[PDB]
């Protein structure tokens, strides 16, 4: 009676979604060719695989997801691997030629031609599903893809269905360090889109889950296939109340309108708790208060900013695991009791928790460890203008000297496009420092 | 088990379930029917599943074509008391249906007679291969 | 899916072609004889990118190879691999040129290209998505650059939404083999700059310094040399034909590392250089890659980045691999020599992963760097062609086919004020 | 129930299957076939190991999928890690 | 060079070898032998230059055959046939049988004649090549 | 008495397979 | 000689921005510490009034 | 050329050393003030129980 649609876009989204995918395979206890294992003759256990995964009646379990993305040569790997048999040979879509780190040839040229292929297949699920909440988006601000085709995409989600859920979950370019030149043109000119096509966007920097994977787990070096399985649970956790059972359950539309307060105002903030390795679990004992302090500390802190030069507008629990709620009460209480952290005056009721029974699971290779408790932050601050007034600032000297406009204008677009995106930012912020001054 | 405490100690401190027990650990699947007096609409096959970790039972019923009833779920992951009564003021530790479960064997869950009629092919050789705990096993005792 | 068509010119460009298509056949396992001998199975996925289908499980390459003078067919179809390349796809004809861009560009070089471009638009069409065109040639003679430029000249037109990458080799002052080549390298840079997506500047000055002090050897014939600028040419479409993490190719590359039109000239470099006896002693780590690359006796051009400034980098790294290093390393130089890169444009450096690494080797890495200091070659060539013509000699073999004598002036013309445009960044 | 688990009694059409897929994708080169596996046996005997067939089949590029393609090369036409060439090459030819 | 000395130094060119010989060419007929079945009748000549011990193909046009043949091996060693890298093993003039079979760059040639200034430096040897050699030529002549 | 890191390679390379607990 | 310098001194003047940088982040965070305290002070008497 | 680089680093790093000396007695003003209304919190509490 519930579902849930996940659209992926980019190489970002189809390497997030293998791994966000195969633990969505092991929690229902799903194997790679796609039914339950022939050594349990009968099943239909609890019906949590159907928000998840359909039902044939030959047994086997479908995912409701799509992937897309403009490079045949990431997207050719899942044909090719493990998990060849489980997913649908079309929910797959494969472009031809690539974006090329670029906006225009993304949005104009390129992504014209396959942006009615997948909203065939859109449809195809949609009506499948009898009861949908919304989409998830995961997509990249730094891909062609992800900024390109995905600021038609949103446009075209919206009017095809209208009062549907929208979220997203962005890879945002890192202050420091970043794999291209151009995405700040990619970064700045996807936003007149997502800012009046989205519903909330949560963002995710990789940078920051360089150094959160070294210092915690004390694995050094690590590779985007162990960054994923982090990312990917996330999603789990969040989607936790929807699948299991729980004190009080989380809807998708819940908490959509608990962080959210302006329509200008749909960047919250993503952060989990706890992180560490097998070594580190048996000797440290993991307490609710112990896994919800390290969530407020700005060293374990998912995006790289820091919420004491800010203020919080609002935050989210999701509280999945051995947990009972009456030191729940008592950790937020305490919260509320540090003058470090700081909130604004007009939300003084800024909390929205979710408890779900089940503790996470674990994959084999992984580098979480086996743990009972969990917790993950979706709260909404205003430091992320700090990372927006550095990011600006890059783009305005860039574009002092109209570098790379020739690789914009000649693919069809104006460059009346580039003036407005820098204006209609320089509004909004204007609109973040205006809700952070109090009365 | 919460309550424990207020005697143990004079200080109450919270219950410690089995950390080890959660950490080694399938789930054990019989194949059950509902018994009561002869009745038209009850033909129903139910598969009852023991968890193993926090020793739980959970009952359920999958969906059957052109039948007047679609149960989806019976119990949801919550543990089973015999129908021995004595519910209050009962000295020791309550009594709970601990995992012995044959075939043949009418457990009698909430009230609900329920007939064990098969087993999961995963749980036959979990019967096999535990013989000390199941007697009834033994290929040397059957002959 | 994407094709790449690799056009050669010249007997320079003859003798790179054959070691190029060398170090492909052995990457993706192919015997002298044409039909594949190798152990895994993804060498097969991207074959169609070079190699060409056909029957009894042949794979043959899309390469058109060309010169005026039949005395360099015999050599290439002499070498280890000539009997892999299709004789229809051999060019040539009865007179060359003879060091001279006069004579191939009007009069020689004109009755050729019309059956040149029979040739590769019998091959360009017969693909199914066609990525671009590559050349390699040379300007120190006329026979692959008075006509080089012509191939140019044309296909430009024809093709015009497509990408198209030049191993030019410009000339060097010290291994200078022609007297005239100053008037050979400026009449095709000039016809060069305007009609071209992507140059670099292969000179033998910085492959000679390599294999004698980088790697240790006493006798560099030129397969040797023509093994180390194929491993850079290989290794700049690592992740076309291989998966990996971070997919590159060409066109994704030069997005980022031309910000205008006429800022296409870049820097090679590779990075697993090490001699024989000093093989066993360094230890390969990703540091180690980045940091004996960026000295600048790694460089394949006659120039120095310590005159200029990096004004964009990229890098394409290779084999199974932690992101995690190379990206602390890249960002330690760009903290650590700040005084080195332009200000007006933040995060300069293009990163690409491919996980395979080619035969003999676990890791490597190759560069691809535009810089203001590459200027330098230009500055060099202009004095010498001005000194040449303010005594007007030579003339006789140019203004005798043809040419009026203003075509100098407009060639000084164009590259003076392209070397001005060059001059405002550093 | 244990007792009559444990007392319990326990090909041409993968052959078939093979030849409608070669049926509908036209892959009749088989001479190429024989004339490669002449050409590179060099010895008396007509055997040779799974490997050497399998990358034959692989780089020829027959419309045939790989998991039919070990099936086939794993349990009939192999004796002892070895495969006639006649036999196999005369099936598989509809 | 590198392994052995710190300072690498020019290999030492053998040229008593090269002094002796000087311009020395021994030919012999092959047949090419290959998969494909209009390669049945392609008859090459060997040369071997005894001064740098050094082997080229030639393959003589066919009148009405529809091949371009010509130049189809150059001046380079052949060093294939079981050969470590460390060490390199080259085809030398002692295996040039009548009968016998090349690997040539993945080729496979069978030589069937050889040239009377052959058979007399046969003669004149005769001691460093094998007894079926001998017996061949004996044979053929 | 009378009466008788293994490899600085490892450390500095790939660990992210094999971590310090797996090294 | 001057151009080692030259390096030490840019290598010198970058390290010491960034101790600039960090310290004036450390005398922000501490003049909004100081106006909390103020307002509890504020509180703290009121309340006793 | 090089010599006014020089001068022009060392200068610079003498007037951001000065910027670090009055980020330090900043840093020591804000703590003494931290100190004093902690203080004044206390008995004012004091009085307040
Ligand atoms: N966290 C994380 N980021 C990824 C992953 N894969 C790619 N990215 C991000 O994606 C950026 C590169 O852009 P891509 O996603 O590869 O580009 P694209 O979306 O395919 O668009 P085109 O390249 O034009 O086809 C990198 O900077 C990464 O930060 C991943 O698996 N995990
Ligand atoms: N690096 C390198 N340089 C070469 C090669 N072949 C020729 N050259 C250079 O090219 C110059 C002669 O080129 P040329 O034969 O006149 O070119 P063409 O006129 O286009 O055929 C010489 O000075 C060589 O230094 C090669 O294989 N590698
Ligand atoms: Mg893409």
């Known amino acids: 009676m519930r579902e849930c649609i996940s659209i992926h876009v980019g190489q970002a989204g189809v390497q997030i979604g293998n791994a966000c995918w195969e633990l969505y395979c092991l929690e229902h206890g799903i194997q790679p060719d796609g039914q339950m294992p022939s050594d349990k003759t009968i099943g239909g256990g609890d019906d949590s695989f159907n928000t998840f995964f359909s039902e044939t009646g030959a047994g086997k379990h479908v995912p409701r997801a799509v992937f897309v993305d403009l490079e045949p040569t990431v997207i050719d790997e899942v044909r090719t691997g493990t998990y060849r048999q489980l997913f649908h040979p079309e929910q797959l879509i494969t472009g031809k030629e690539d974006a090329a780190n670029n906006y225009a040839r993304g949005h104009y040229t390129i992504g014209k031609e396959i942006i009615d292929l997948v909203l065939d297949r859109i449809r195809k699920l949609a009506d499948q599903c009898t009861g949908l909440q919304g989409f998830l988006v995961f997509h990249s601000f730094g891909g062609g893809t992800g900024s390109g085709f995905t600021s038609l995409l949103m446009e075209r989600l919206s009017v095809d269905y209208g009062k549907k859920s929208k979220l997203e979950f962005s890879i945002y370019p890192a202050p420091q360090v970043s794999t291209a030149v151009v995405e700040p043109y990619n970064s700045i000119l996807t936003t007149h889109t997502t800012l009046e096509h989205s519903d909330c966007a949560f963002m995710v920097d990789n940078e920051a889950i360089y150094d959160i994977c070294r210092r915690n787990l004390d694995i050094e070096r690590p590779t985007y296939t162990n960054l994923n399985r982090l990312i990917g649970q996330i999603v789990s956790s969040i989607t936790a109340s929807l699948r299991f059972d729980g004190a009080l359950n989380v809807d998708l539309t819940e908490f959509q309108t608990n962080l959210v307060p302006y329509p200008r105002i749909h960047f919250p903030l993503a952060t989990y708790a706890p992180v560490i390795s097998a070594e580190k679990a048996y000797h440290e004992q993991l307490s609710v208060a112990e896994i919800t302090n390290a969530c407020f500390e700005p060293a374990n802190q998912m995006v790289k900013c820091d919420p004491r030069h800010g203020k919080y507008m609002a935050c989210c629990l999701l509280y999945r695991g051995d947990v009972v709620p009456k030191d729940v009460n008592a950790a937020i209480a305490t919260i509320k009791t540090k003058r470090t952290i700081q909130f604004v005056d007009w939300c003084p009721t800024g909390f929205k928790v979710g408890i779900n029974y089940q503790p996470p699971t674990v994959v084999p290779g992984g580098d979480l460890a086996k743990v009972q408790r969990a917790v993950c932050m979706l709260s909404n601050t205003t430091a992320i203008a700090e990372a927006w007034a550095r990011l600006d600032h890059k783009f305005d000297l860039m574009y002092a000297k109209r570098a790379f406009v020739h690789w914009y204008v000649g693919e069809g677009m104006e460059e009346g496009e580039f003036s407005e995106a820098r204006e209609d930012m320089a509004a909004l912020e204007k609109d973040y420092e205006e809700v952070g001054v109090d009365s | 088990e919460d309550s424990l405490r207020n005697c143990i100690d004079l200080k109450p401190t919270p219950h410690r379930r089995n950390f080890k027990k959660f950490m080694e650990k399938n789930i054990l699947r019989f194949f059950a029917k509902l018994v009561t007096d002869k009745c038209v609409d009850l033909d129903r096959m139910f598969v009852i599943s023991y968890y193993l970790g926090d020793d739980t039972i959970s009952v359920f019923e999958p969906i059957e074509r052109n039948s007047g009833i679609a149960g989806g779920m019976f119990l949801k992951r919550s543990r089973v008391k015999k129908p021995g009564q004595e519910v209050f003021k009962s000295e020791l530790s309550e009594y709970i249906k601990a995992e012995e479960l044959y075939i043949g064997v009418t457990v009698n869950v909430n009230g609900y007679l329920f007939r064990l009629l098969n087993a999961d092919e995963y749980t036959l050789n979990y019967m096999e291969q535990n013989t000390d705990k199941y007697p009834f096993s033994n290929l040397k005792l059957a002959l | 899916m994407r094709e790449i068509v690799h056009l050669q010119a010249g007997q320079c460009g003859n003798q790179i072609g054959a070691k190029f298509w060398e170090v492909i056949s052995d990457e993706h396992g192919i015997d002298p004889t044409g039909t594949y001998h190798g152990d895994s199975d993804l060498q097969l996925e991207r074959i169609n990118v070079y190699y060409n289908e056909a029957t009894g499980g042949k794979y043959v390459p899309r390469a058109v190879l060309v010169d005026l003078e039949p005395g360099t067919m015999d050599s290439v179809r002499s070498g280890p691999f000539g009997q892999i390349f299709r004789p229809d796809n051999f060019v040539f004809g009865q007179s060359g040129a003879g060091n001279n861009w006069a004579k191939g560009h009007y009069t020689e070089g004109a009755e050729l290209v019309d059956s040149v471009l029979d040739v590769v638009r019998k091959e360009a069409e017969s693909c199914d998505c066609l990525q671009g065109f590559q050349l390699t040639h040379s300007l120190g003679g006329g026979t692959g650059s008075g006509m080089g430029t012509l191939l140019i000249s044309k296909i430009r037109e024809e093709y015009p939404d497509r990408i198209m990458n030049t191993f030019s080799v410009v000339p060097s002052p010290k291994v200078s083999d022609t007297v005239v080549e100053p008037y050979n390298a400026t009449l095709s840079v000039h016809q060069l700059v305007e009609n071209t997506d992507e140059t670099y500047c292969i000179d033998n000055e910085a492959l000679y310094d390599i294999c004698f002090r980088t790697l240790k050897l006493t006798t560099p014939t030129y397969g040797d040399l023509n093994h180390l600028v194929s491993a850079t040419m290989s290794g700049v479409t690592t992740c076309l034909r291989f998966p990996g993490q971070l997919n590159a190719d060409l066109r994704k590359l030069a997005v980022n590392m031309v910000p205008f039109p006429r800022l296409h000239f870049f820097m090679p470099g590779f990075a697993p250089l090490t001699s024989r006896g000093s093989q066993q002693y360094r230890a390969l780590t990703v540091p180690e890659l980045t940091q004996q690359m960026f000295d600048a006796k790694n460089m394949m051009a006659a120039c120095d980045p310590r005159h200029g400034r990096y004004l964009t980098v990229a890098a394409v790294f290779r084999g199974r691999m932690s992101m995690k290093e190379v990206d602390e390393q890249m960002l330690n130089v760009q903290n650590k020599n700040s005084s080195y890169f332009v200000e007006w444009i933040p995060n300069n450096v293009k990163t690409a992963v491919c996980d395979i690494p080619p035969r003999g080797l676990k890791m490597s890495a190759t560069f691809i760097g535009n810089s203001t200091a590459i200027q330098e070659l230009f500055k060099r060539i202009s004095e010498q062609f001005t000194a040449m013509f303010r005594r007007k000699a030579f003339l006789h073999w140019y203004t005798g086919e043809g040419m009026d004598e203003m075509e100098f002036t407009e060639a000084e013309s164009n590259m003076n004020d392209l070397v001005s445009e060059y001059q405002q960044y550093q | 129930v244990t007792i009559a688990r444990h007392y319990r009694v326990p090909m041409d059409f993968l052959i078939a299957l093979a030849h409608e897929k070669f049926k509908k994708n036209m892959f009749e080169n088989f001479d190429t076939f024989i004339y490669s596996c002449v050409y590179e046996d060099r010895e008396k005997k007509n055997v040779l190991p799974t490997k050497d067939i399998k990358r034959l089949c692989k780089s020829s590029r027959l419309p045939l999928s790989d998991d039919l393609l070990e099936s086939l090369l794993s349990r009939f036409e192999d004796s002892e890690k070895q495969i006639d060439y006649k036999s196999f090459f005369s099936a598989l030819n509809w | 060079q590198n392994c052995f000395a710190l300072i690498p130094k020019a290999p030492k060119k053998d040229v008593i070898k090269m002094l002796v010989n000087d311009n020395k060419v021994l030919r012999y007929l092959a047949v090419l032998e290959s998969p494909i079945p209009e390669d049945k009748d392609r008859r090459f000549v060997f040369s071997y230059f005894l001064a740098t011990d050094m082997i080229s193909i030639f393959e003589p046009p066919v009148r009405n055959s529809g091949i371009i043949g010509g130049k189809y091996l150059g001046r380079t060693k052949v060093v294939k046939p079981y050969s470590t890298v460390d060490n390199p093993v080259y085809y030398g003039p002692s295996d040039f049988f009548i009968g016998a079979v090349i690997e040539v760059f993945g080729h496979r040639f069978i030589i069937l004649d050889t040239d009377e200034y052959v058979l007399k430096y046969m003669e004149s040897n005769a001691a460093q090549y094998s007894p079926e050699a001998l017996a061949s030529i004996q044979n053929h002549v | ?23 | 000689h001057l151009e080692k310098e030259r390096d030490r001194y840019i290598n010198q003047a970058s390290d010491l921005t960034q101790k600039v940088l960090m310290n004036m982040e450390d005398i922000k965070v501490r003049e909004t510490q100081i106006f909390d305290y103020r307002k509890k002070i504020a509180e703290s008497e009121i309340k006793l009034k």
Not at chain 6, 4 to 19: E, I, P, R, V
Request: hydrophobic content about 30%.
């Open chain 6, 1 to 23: 008495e009378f009466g008788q890191g293994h490899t600085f390679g490892h450390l500095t390379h790939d660990a992210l397979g094999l971590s310090t607990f797996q090294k």
